[PDB]
Each structure stands twice: as structure tokens, then as C-alpha cells.
Design a protein around this ligand. Structure first.
Ligand code: FMN
Ligand code: P81
Length: 362
């Protein structure tokens, strides 16, 4: 078994390769999109993870697409996250913040000024996001048609990611994970399906990857390359965003570019909850020979699959999502071959302590 051996992940050393995937739980305070002590307790309970990757967190107010998702742009958010990371560190854990802009997976009612959300192009996501009703409960609502960003708005987006990374470093996070997956803003630019621009940010794969690479360069300069990870979902379809007609070649282009920056890790989200075709071993080999940081695999993994791929030299770590919702001590359970707590999906999104901090350890 290799799952319980250490791994250098850029600037930090994980004691095991069982990571907690980023999980939106929609329990932040509104107004202000403020993280809470309850959230702090949830993360503290999971501090034995080799690395905790936080729920997706807004880089700016404009970034918001879900009611109850936290930000990392305001003083009050910074102050609240400081307490949370301190708690994780007091339990000898490590925590990365996943930073997003939701782009078109959003709703005008939660945007600044009540305006349409922004994207690469003015194309509706044709999916739903999660808002809150008058009683504060999560509700699924159709996404608002976005406004295409003007060319002169692009530098501001890059700066928002940079600023959020400055704030993250101050807030005590050990690493940052850029959310370049799942049909959110960075992926909206990457994918031909959502990007019909005819300027330097659309068309060719070079142009489609331009924004994400500008963001990577800006955040490496703000902090250090060994503090930066990125999550991609570059094969298949996620929330109606496919990866275009040349998905493998386009993915390898992006990955070779990322490798040049010497970033800490590449986190590949391989499938959504409905599943689909597995990654080919040939594709995994092509990724591995191009990227010289840590590779994290995710998407309906088992410990046995993680061991197999780690043993084959193709990935370095695995991120578990739903098993981490339900098992604060997932590391110990996998080490001991113990049963896993029964998941309660009705309390994944919104609410309070129930279905959040009440799953027991062994
Ligand atoms: C409730 C829930 C929230 C999620 N939130 C995020 C998120 O904030 N960021 C992200 O990149 N993926 C998110 N995902 C995807 C998970 O990180 C993970 O990739 C997915 O659950 C598949 O892995 P699993 O089979 O181990 O759960 C979420 C998944 C679930 C079930
Ligand atoms: O259902 N939700 O409210 C959120 C889901 C979600 C958020 C981020 C992500 O990368 C995937 C799913």
C-alpha cells in the first residue's frame, strides 16, 4: 500500500495520499458570503486528510453563482477564514482554498446590481444553480443568460484571481487550487462549446487557454509556483460543458503549458456523478510524461483504484468527495479497512450541522 505514505505537494508535505476533494456545501452567512465556525468545525474534523481542498470560494462578489458559497474578497471573509485555517493547523492538517469564478453558472438575483452574470460568450449554461428561498433553504434555479466579457474586462478578472490569492495567503491557506473545471468561468473560456469569441481569448486552443494561463502566471507571481494547484475536467462533459472536438490534444497542450510554470499540482476531475468512459491508460501516460508536479485523480475512486494507479506511476494522490462528506476519519477507515458511514445526500447542500458535522469517527 502506498496510500498511507507521504507526498511532497509543492511547498507542503502531505503525510498520506488520501485527499479531501473540494465540496460546495452552501452553509455560509448572507449577507456577506461569510464562512462560519460551523464550517471551521467541519474542516477540523477532517484534518487527518493528506490535504484538505476547500469548497469553491469566490474571488470577488461578481464571481458568486450559488447562495451560501463563501468568498475570499472582503475583510470579514478574510477574518473568518483565518480562524478556520488556524483550527485546521492546530490539528496538524493542511488546507488549500479552491478559488472560482462561476461565470455563467449563476443567476442575476445574486450578482452585483442584480445584473446578468459574465462569461466568454452570451450563451446560457442551460443548467441550474442553487439559490436560497425566503426561509434560507437551498433551491435549484435555472441559470441566467450571461453577458460576454469585453476584451478590456479581462485584466480585471486576472487581477481578481491575483488579489484572492494574496488574501488566501494572508488567511493562512497552505495552497490555492484554481477552479478550471466543471463549466465555471475558466472552463467556459477553455471549451469551444461555451466560447464563441473571435478575439485573442477564443478560437484556437492557444486563445482558449489564454485566460487560465494568464491567471496561473499572475498567481505564481503573487505567491510562488509551489503554492499553486489547478483543477481541470478536460475529458468529457460536465454541467453541459463538453471539451470540444479535439479534447485530448487540447488537454495535453494545456498540461504542457502548466508544466512550464512548475506549479505544485494538477488535479484531474475525471467524471461527474452520473459517470462515463474512463480515462485510457495511454492518455494517463501522455499526461504523466508532460507534467512534473503532483497529479491528483478524482471521480468515483476506490482506495483499490487509487493504489493501482499510484503503483503504475500514473498519479500520486486521490481526492475523495462524498466519502469525505460522510467520514471525517476517512484516512483511518481506509487504513483499517473499516466500513464507511452511510451518506445522507439530502443534507449535502445548505442547512446546518445536521449532515455536516454529525458524521462520526470510528
Ligand atoms: C456536494 C458536492 C459538492 C461539490 N462541490 C465541488 C466544488 O466545490 N468544487 C469542485 O471542484 N468539485 C465539487 N464537487 C465534485 C467533487 O469534488 C468530486 O470530484 C465528486 O464528488 C466525485 O468524486 P466522489 O465520487 O469521490 O464523490 C462536488 C461534489 C459534491 C457531491
Ligand atoms: O450543486 N451545487 O450546489 C453545487 C455543485 C458544484 C459546485 C462546484 C463544482 O465544481 C461542482 C459541483
Amino acid at each position: 500500500e502506498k496510500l498511507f505514505t507521504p507526498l511532497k505537494v509543492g511547498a507542503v508535505t502531505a503525510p498520506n495520499r488520501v485527499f479531501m476533494a473540494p465540496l460546495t456545501r452552501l452553509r455560509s452567512i448572507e449577507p456577506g458570503d461569510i464562512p462560519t465556525p460551523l464550517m471551521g468545525e467541519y474542516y477540523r474534523q477532517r484534518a487527518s486528510a493528506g490535504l484538505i481542498i476547500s469548497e469553491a470560494t469566490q474571488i470577488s462578489a461578481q464571481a458568486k453563482g450559488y447562495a451560501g458559497a463563501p468568498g475570499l474578497h472582503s475583510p470579514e471573509q478574510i477574518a473568518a477564514w483565518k480562524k478556520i485555517t488556524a483550527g485546521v493547523h492546530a490539528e496538524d492538517g493542511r488546507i488549500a482554498v479552491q478559488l472560482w469564478h462561476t461565470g455563467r453558472i449563476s443567476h442575476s438575483s445574486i450578482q452585483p446590481g442584480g445584473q446578468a452574470p459574465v462569461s466568454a460568450s452570451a450563451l446560457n449554461a442551460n443548467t441550474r444553480t442553487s439559490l436560497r428561498d425566503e426561509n434560507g433553504n437551498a433551491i435549484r434555479v435555472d441559470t441566467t443568460t450571461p453577458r460576454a466579457l469585453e476584451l478590456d474586462e479581462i485584466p480585471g478578472i486576472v487581477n481578481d484571481f491575483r488579489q484572492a490569492v494574496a488574501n488566501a495567503r494572508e488567511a493562512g491557506f497552505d495552497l490555492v487550487e484554481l477552479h478550471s473545471a466543471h463549466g465555471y468561468l475558466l472552463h467556459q473560456f477553455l471549451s469551444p462549446s461555451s466560447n464563441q469569441r473571435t478575439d485573442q481569448y477564443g478560437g484556437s486552443v492557444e486563445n482558449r487557454a489564454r485566460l487560465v494561463l494568464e491567471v496561473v502566471d499572475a498567481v505564481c507571481n503573487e505567491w510562488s509556483a509551489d503554492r499553486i494547484g489547478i483543477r481541470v475536467s478536460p475529458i468529457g462533459t460536465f454541467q453541459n460543458v463538453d471539451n470540444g472536438p479535439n479534447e485530448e490534444a487540447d488537454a495535453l497542450y494545456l498540461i504542457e503549458e502548466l508544466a512550464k510554470r512548475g506549479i505544485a499540482y494538477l488535479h484531474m476531475s475525471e467524471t461527474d456523478l452520473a459517470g462515463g468512459k474512463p480515462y485510457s491508460e495511454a492518455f494517463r501516460q501522455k499526461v504523466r510524461e508532460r507534467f512534473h508536479g503532483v497529479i491528483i485523480g478524482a471521480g468515483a475512486y476506490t482506495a483499490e483504484k487509487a493504489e493501482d494507479l499510484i503503483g503504475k506511476g500514473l498519479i500520486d494522490a486521490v481526492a475523495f468527495g462524498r466519502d469525505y462528506i460522510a467520514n471525517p476519519d476517512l484516512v483511518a477507515r481506509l487504513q483499517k479497512k473499516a466500513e464507511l458511514n452511510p451518506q445522507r445526500p439530502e443534507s449535502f447542500y445548505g442547512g446546518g450541522a445536521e449532515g455536516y458535522t454529525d458524521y462520526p469517527s470510528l
